[PDB]
């Protein structure tokens, strides 16, 4: 009966990382692309995004992935990669334990959805589990 | 500190001090950082209060501006020191060779381990001069009892 | 004690030229039914699992395609189905860590393999660099 969620990216979304319900249980909601915490407590929060490109363009490519908390906006977990015509592939994966409050909204965002590996949307995920 | 939560599961999430000169110094006295249900932070190490299975994780982020003439090797290692054994042991480790455009190299390490009461866990790097602290949430170390 | 099937196995640092997973090593584990048989993790019960693996390749200069693949062999289709795969072209010492991870629905008796194409390029200098594990969600 512990609040839990595991949401996955929509492969059909254009220019965005749209989360889809995968599961939501025991009060967790997915609203406006954010996971909504039903009760105060410790939660493991995790995510993985996958990027891919064909070669390197004229502008420097920096890929970011950040999990933030908005209490009723602060970065909890974040990382950046610089991958740069040969194909390249890079994952960014994050996780940690945090004390959350009722009604907190969690977001898992990237700066370059144009580089998402949409074909592997099943493994572009974001989830929480109450501990 | 002695914080408690209803599940009584030992947990910790500590973060780097960005102004620590030439080192990776962990802190629990920060917003969105914590020690609960018996975990202690002593001499820069997490101290396990009870035996059991634990998830152990850490992330560091390195950044440089271009590539220098000397070879850059970046390492991040999580180690365990047991009381009965008194021997250091690497649990998780990675090495990266990133090489003027900025480069970024995160290192995330995570796994599941059987730990013993009184074990001390360390999370260390070889190049604190390449650590990046431009945003919160980039450098951290934690444990979660299952 | 936790009842969730879990495993974290590590490469045998002295088995140079091979990728042999070990569960008896210090800081390697099998719990709650997971087995290590014929170099594969055996799933004890159906459910959602995180599967992960890190390998680390190293070379001294450039003479190379490096692959890392996690596959599933089901009792109902006893052939490798690739679940996660990566390929790198690394070409002074170079290092190439490869991480694979994902959440999958597994069945009782599934065998999971984590394999590379070039064990001659694996780095076995330090402990904790090469591992393969599962965690029942
Ligand atoms: C507590 C419970 C219910 O047993 C449970 N354990 C683990 C997960 C889980 C699932 C998917 C994940 N993807 C990642 N992680 C995931 C954790 C993080 C990570 C991996 C391995 C070690 C430590 C951290 C961070 C990297 C990406 C979910 N639920």
UniProtKB/Swiss-Prot annotation, chain C:
| Disulphides | 62-91
The domain of life is Eukaryota
- Result after altering residue 25 to W: Biologically inactive
Provide the effect of residue 29 to F. Answer: Biologically inactive
Q: Where is the THD domain?
A: 5-137
For the Extracellular compartment, the record's topological domain ranges are 1-137
> Where does it reside?
Secreted
Question: What is this protein's record name?
Answer: Tumor necrosis factor, soluble form
Q: What is the lineage of its organism?
A: Eukaryota, Metazoa, Chordata, Craniata, Vertebrata
Which residues of the whole protein are included? 84 to 233 of 233
């Amino acid at each position: 009966d512990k609040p839990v969620a595991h949401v996955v990216a929509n492969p059909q979304a254009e220019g965005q990382l749209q989360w889809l319900n995968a599961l939501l249980a025991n009060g967790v909601e997915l609203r406006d692309n954010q996971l909504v915490v039903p009760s105060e407590g410790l939660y493991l929060i995790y995510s993985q995004v996958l990027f891919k490109g064909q070669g390197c363009p004229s502008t420097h490519v920096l890929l970011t992935h950040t999990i933030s908390r908005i209490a009723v906006k602060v970065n909890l977990l974040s990382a950046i990669k610089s991958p740069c015509a040969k194909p390249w592939y890079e994952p960014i994966y994050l996780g940690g334990v945090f004390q959350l409050e009722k009604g907190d909204r969690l977001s898992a965002e990237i700066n370059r959805p144009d580089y998402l590996d949409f074909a592997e949307s099943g493994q572009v995920y974001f989830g929480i589990i109450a501990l």
